[PDB]
Nucleic acid binder design. Structure first.
Lengths: 110, 110
RNA sequence: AUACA
């Protein structure tokens, strides 16, 4: 597992109003960290608004030519289980998208 | 965050190696988001028993004079609900300790 | 009451 890779996993079961529904998550933490900690920080992919681009907490996606149709959002993230659920590797996003995600996590730290 | 907000809420339900159980948690999300989506991210507190010590990401709430004698897991935060689940603030953590937690939470930007 | 169980 490397940085910028997209792994399919489920965030459920959810309660109240969490981000429910199986979707591919993006690996935010570097391989070195994931290797020793074995707990990678991931962000959920949801909708945005009009187009699959930057929507506040949602980062831009459509433009690099990917198979995953959606918008990466760093609004409601959480370190879920990737041991019993199992992650399925799909594809990977360019460094362009990686920088986008790394700029939304700072806005939640307050 | 809003600074110094230790709320008690039920982390359940959960599945896999994720945090669960009704215990005090430290919110990370700021007022500009906590009062918007109503879905904040909380850091699970882990009781130390009679004494606690700071280590790595584990922030020690014990020492300065706090009721909650334990360490916060600034490694596995989960997005939950703070309206339907039902939460209540127990005590207010000193600004000194609050800064320590935030400093540990800065490791997720690596 | 920024969400594709």
């Amino acid at each position: 597992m490397e940085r910028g890779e997209i792994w399919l996993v489920s965030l459920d079961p959810t309660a109240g109003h969490e981000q429910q529904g199986t979707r591919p998550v993006l690996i935010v933490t570097p391989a070195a960290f994931n290797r020793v900690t074995r707990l990678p920080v991931v962000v959920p992919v949801t909708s945005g608004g009009n187009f699959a681009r930057t929507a506040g907490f949602a980062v831009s996606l459509d433009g690099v030519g990917i198979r995953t149709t959606g918008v990466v959002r760093c609004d409601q993230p959480r370190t879920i289980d990737m041991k019993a659920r199992g992650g399925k590797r799909l594809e990977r996003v360019p460094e362009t998208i990686m920088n986008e995600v790394l700029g939304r996590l700072s806005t939640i730290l307050t």
